[PDB]
Amino acid sequence: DTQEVNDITTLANLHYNGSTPADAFEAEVTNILDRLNNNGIPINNKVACQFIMRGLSGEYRSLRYARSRCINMTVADLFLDIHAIYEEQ
Amino acid sequence: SDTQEVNDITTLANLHYNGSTPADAFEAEVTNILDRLNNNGIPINNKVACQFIMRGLSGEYRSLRYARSRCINMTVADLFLDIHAIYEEQ
């Protein structure tokens, strides 16, 4: 009953600093976006990008410098950058 | 401006009302958030909007959360009337 509200809240309160696997973070955010699109709440690529960048902490905060191109960025590309920084760790 | 949708969704997720501000301004802020989100392509159902507004109710207005069983059964307008009733009584 609250699946949409909890998913939107978790999308709004994303937080990543590299202490957990970047692949798991990517997959769980993708599940949030997928359940929200199936429940009637479409999240554009720019909006999902903005949320994920607001959630990046630590070295990943560096990625926020590209936040001007959140429209030009892709959720997949941002997730790949996160995976690269995580592989460097 | 570019992040307007994210800011509106964040404000909708962290609503907070306890009666210290006018209920008209609170209703207006919730309605503006919902309207901008629907105009930008993010439709918030009546049940979802009710759940969001009720999660924010504090103080005596916490009593209103007891009607949370009727989220689909209740419109945003009815919740706003309840909030206005408690505020006018205060």
Numbering used by the authors:
A (entry chain B): 262 to 350
B (entry chain A): 261 to 350
Quoted from the paper:
Saccharomyces cerevisiae prevents uncontrolled retrotransposition of Ty1 subfamilies using distinct mechanisms: canonical Ty1 is inhibited by a self-encoded restriction factor, p22/p18, whereas Ty1’ is inhibited by an endogenized restriction factor, Drt2. The minimal inhibitory fragment of both restriction factors (p18m and Drt2m) is a conserved C-terminal capsid domain. Although the crystal structures of p18m and Drt2m are similar, three divergent residues found in a conserved hydrophobic interface direct restriction specificity. Structural and genetic analyses of p18m reveal that p18m and Ty1 Gag interact through a hydrophobic region that is shared between both proteins, termed the Dimer-1 interface. These observations suggest a lattice-poisoning model of restriction by p18m in which the CTD binds full-length Gag and forms dead-end intermediates in VLP assembly.
Ty1’ is not subject to the canonical CNC mechanism and is instead restricted by DRT2, a gene present at a fixed chromosomal locus that encodes the Ty1’ Gag CTD equivalent to p22. Drt2 also associates with Ty1’ Gag while forming VLPs and likely uses a lattice-poisoning mechanism to restrict retrotransposition. The asymmetric unit of wildtype and Ty1’ CA-CTD (F323S) crystals both contain two monomers arranged through a single Dimer-1 interface and the Drt2m(SS) crystals contain four Drt2m(SS) monomers arranged as two dimer-pairs through Dimer-1 interfaces. Further comparison of the p18m dimer with that of Drt2m(SS) reveals the strong similarity demonstrated by the 3D superposition of RMSD of 0.7 Å over 155 Cα backbone atoms. Inspection of the location of these divergent residues reveals that in p18m and Drt2m the three divergent residues lie at the center of the hydrophobic Dimer-1 interface. By contrast, in Drt2m and Ty1’ CA-CTD, it is the V266 sidechain on helix α1 that closely packs against F312 on helix α3 and because of the greater steric bulk of the V and F residues the distance between the V266 and F312 Cα atoms is increased to 6.8 Å. Concurrent with the increased spacing in the VTF interface of Drt2m and Ty1’ CA-CTD, the side chain of the conserved residue R315 can adopt a rotamer that allows it to swing in and hydrogen bond with T270 which is not possible with V270 in p18m. Thus, this “arginine-flip” mechanism provides a further level of discrimination and specificity between AVL and VTF Dimer-1 interfaces.
